[PDB]
Amino acid sequence: MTHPDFTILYVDNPPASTQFYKALLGVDPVESSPTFSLFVLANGMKLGLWSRHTVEPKASVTGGGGELAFRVENDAQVDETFAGWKASGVAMLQQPAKMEFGYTFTAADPDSHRLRVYAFAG
Amino acid sequence: MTHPDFTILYVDNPPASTQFYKALLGVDPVESSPTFSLFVLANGMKLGLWSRHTVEPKASVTGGGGELAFRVENDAQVDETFAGWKASGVAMLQQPAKMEFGYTFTAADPDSHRLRVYAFAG
Structure with missing residues (x-):
């Protein structure tokens, strides 16, 4: 019943990983935090970067999915x-x-x- | 440079997991396969279900990310x-x-x- 237009990808080090997605996609983070980032695409979709050291539920994984x-x-x-x-x-x-x-x-x-x-x- | 409006979530058993997302989101799979599924949302985003037994690179994981x-x-x-x-x-x-x-x-x-x-x- 609830539609997600927003997908989040779990990163380790926000500064380096956010600049990486900046050039990767071709976007700039509209929202950003010391342990988080958010950019919204002109495609009509939305994309987050949530740091795994502050994710809930807490999961120390990279490349699992x-x-x-x-x-x-x-x-x-x-x-x-x-x-x-x-x-x-x-x-x-x-x-x-x-x-x-x-x-x-x-x-x-x-x-x-x-x-x-x-x-x-x- | 390349913008993704499409996110894929890796599932194990396509039939049960695809019907699960049907009611979960409130969508129907426009495309579907014995080992894959695809539905596109009126939000202007796109969402896949790729079975992990046929994912490339091959990864037997569930809940890693x-x-x-x-x-x-x-x-x-x-x-x-x-x-x-x-x-x-x-x-x-x-x-x-x-x-x-x-x-x-x-x-x-x-x-x-x-x-x-x-x-x-x-």
């Missing part, structure tokens, strides 16, 4: 996003491969979130 | 969403408490995702 799907028009735009992140200092452990749902790619940043850039086959 | 922030007008609407989920068979391990960012509450479903219903103080 949370997937951020970056939608692009086609397979070439996936590869542009690949190389740009790679040069921008993403860990990057996954082969960009043609899946059933289309050309999918998933990265892992310093704080390790599954950043899923895909091109839908339809 | 991924946070779904359900935004409501005030603290009472948080408590309505609390009891409704509770009656609908959510695990629910967190006290709905007044945080710095407002009245926050976080649930965990059968597949265990941090479902964050909050009322922003400001």
Whole structure:
């Protein structure tokens, strides 16, 4: 009954991780705190960064879950996003491969979130 | 540079978990597969269910991360969403408490995702 237009990705060190998402997405944090961050996209969606040392329920995890799907028009735009992140200092452990749902790619940043850039086959 | 209006939450058993999100959010899966699901919200956002047995990179985890922030007008609407989920068979391990960012509450479903219903103080 309640609709979430807001997704939160759990980070460790707010300063470095927030500047990382600033250039990663191409946004600026409208709201920010010593242990939290918030930016709202012109897409009509909303995206948080909640530090895991202050998350409730308290969970010391990085890379356990949370997937951020970056939608692009086609397979070439996936590869542009690949190389740009790679040069921008993403860990990057996954082969960009043609899946059933289309050309999918998933990265892992310093704080390790599954950043899923895909091109839908339809 | 690339903006994600799409967030994916990693589930174990697609049938049961997809019907769970159907009533949870109040949506129907526009796209669906034997090991995947996809529904797009009238909020202007997009939400996937990717089964962890077919996720790339492959990760057998549930409750490690991924946070779904359900935004409501005030603290009472948080408590309505609390009891409704509770009656609908959510695990629910967190006290709905007044945080710095407002009245926050976080649930965990059968597949265990941090479902964050909050009322922003400001």
